[PDB]
Amino acid sequence: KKIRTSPTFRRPKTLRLRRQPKYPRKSAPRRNKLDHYAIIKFPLTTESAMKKIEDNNTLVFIVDVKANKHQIKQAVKKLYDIDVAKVNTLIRPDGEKKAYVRLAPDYDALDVANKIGII
């Protein structure tokens, strides 16, 4: 009481199990070497960068090259407790990433620059 409907013979869908390993291949998971401190190296004290901070409500940072804009945003928000309007990235011809962090207009840029130390 079973007939071949189709003239082709396709391979039957057999049951396959999942990875239930008896021992883990590595003893510990790898620690996060892309932390909030290690992802932001330093800000710039360029006069052009300070004009950018004083005029356009931003902060200029030098970032490791393996970073996302979301990573830089959550990194600034985690380190200095300040909200971010947007993160705007480029890569210099020296290997480093440059991040213009446009801040929210409820917090000042010159005050948080005085907090982080640059003037």
């Binding site: 007939i3 071949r4 409907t5 189709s6 003239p7 082709t8 013979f9």
Partner: protein, 241 residues
């Protein structure tokens, strides 16, 4: 009324150019895989080619009633089992030094399983009945052995299935099973089976060895040969008779 005239018959014409053909039985025309087509047309080659009698003697198989009676007799003499070995060792280990047991006493008769043991105790003429599975996949293991049983005078029979021959022992496959020793309550049934097997295999081994077998054409060509023979009979049988 319980009937409704809104129920149109609307039959379907399953003809050429008419309505579409249904999903009918199509097992005749499946593109089967290579191993399926190989194991089918291998048996087709066994049907076509002139099989020599040393291989073709295994199509002669002992029948259903005598096979079930032989299995009923072998079930009385099936060997022991895994952990029944352990019970049999532990019982004699407790019998050794608890109640002055020296144990030379008695072992029950069992069957044999390998072709080596079967050929040795047929050459020793210690066998009484040798069961051979017909469906061993290398046939070279058992070709000589029916002839060897006929030479040594030991009755040999051939049964369907190395699977059900190896279900007598607690294993998967088995090719030869020898009956060495039987009890007095089963010796009469053993002699009846020996007579019924010897009047089928040993007494007409000349007809078995001369029984060539093969050249069985496929039905598509057998029907064509039969059509040509009926055409020749229609052309010249009523011209004479």
């Amino acid at each position: 009324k319980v009937v409704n005239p809104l129920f149109e018959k609307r039959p379907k014409n399953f003809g050429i150019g008419q309505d579409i053909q249904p999903k009918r039985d199509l097992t005749r025309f499946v593109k089967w895989p290579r191993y399926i087509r190989l194991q089918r047309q291998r048996a087709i080659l066994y049907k076509r080619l002139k099989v020599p009698p040393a291989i073709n003697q295994f199509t002669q198989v002992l029948d259903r009633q005598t096979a079930t009676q032989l299995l009923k007799l072998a079930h009385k003499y099936r060997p022991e089992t895994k952990q029944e070995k352990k019970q049999r060792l532990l019982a004699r280990a407790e019998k050794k030094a608890a109640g002055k047991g020296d144990v030379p006493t008695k072992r029950p008769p069992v069957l044999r399983a390998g072709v080596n043991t079967v050929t040795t105790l047929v050459e020793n003429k210690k066998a009484q009945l040798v069961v051979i599975a017909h469906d061993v996949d290398p046939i070279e293991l058992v070709v000589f052995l029916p002839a060897l049983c006929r030479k040594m005078g030991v009755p040999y029979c051939i049964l369907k299935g190395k699977a059900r021959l190896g279900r007598l022992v607690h294993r998967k496959t088995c090719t030869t099973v020898a009956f060495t020793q039987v009890n007095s309550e089963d010796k009469g049934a053993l002699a009846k089976l020996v007579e019924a097997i010897r009047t089928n295999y040993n007494d007409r081994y000349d007809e078995i060895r001369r029984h060539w077998g093969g050249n069985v054409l496929g039905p598509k060509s057998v029907a064509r040969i039969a059509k040509l023979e009926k055409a020749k009979a229609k052309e010249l049988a009523t011209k004479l008779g």
